[PDB]
Amino acid sequence: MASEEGQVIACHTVETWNEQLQKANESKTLVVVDFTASWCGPCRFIAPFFADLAKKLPNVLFLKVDTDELKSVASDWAIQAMPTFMFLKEGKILDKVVGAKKDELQSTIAKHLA
């Protein structure tokens, strides 16, 4: 019985990023992506919470996109504020949270929490 929760897929390459998104689309999986940087303070501070989210939601695909890593990807998705949390459903973008917002994030989470 393999049930590994609490983990987020960190794409250090576009391949993993692509691989997961295509899968999320095809498998109609709800995906939440965090565009962030490991060298970013508030971004790192909000990181355990996103992992916590993964810990309760194994049916949701969580992804870490590091903006230092995938800087060109972050530029195409137009992520200028860090971190940006994007909530998609079935691979289709629903809504995103721009910047680390502690209280408001919760409200965006509750929106999707059902």
From Swiss-Prot:
Record key words, sorted: Acetylation, Cytoplasm, Disulfide bond, Electron transport, Redox-active center, Transport
Domain of life assignment: Eukaryota
GO biological process: positive regulation of catalytic activity
GO MF: enzyme activator activity; oxidoreductase activity, acting on a sulfur group of donors, disulfide as acceptor; protein-disulfide reductase activity
Record-annotated disulphide pairs: C40-C43
PROSITE patterns in UniProt: THIOREDOXIN_1, THIOREDOXIN_2
Similarity annotation: Belongs to the thioredoxin family. Plant H-type subfamily.
PANTHER family: THIOREDOXIN (PTHR10438), THIOREDOXIN H1 (PTHR10438:SF425)
Name of protein: Thioredoxin H1
Natural source organism: Arabidopsis thaliana (Mouse-ear cress)
Gene for this chain: TRX1
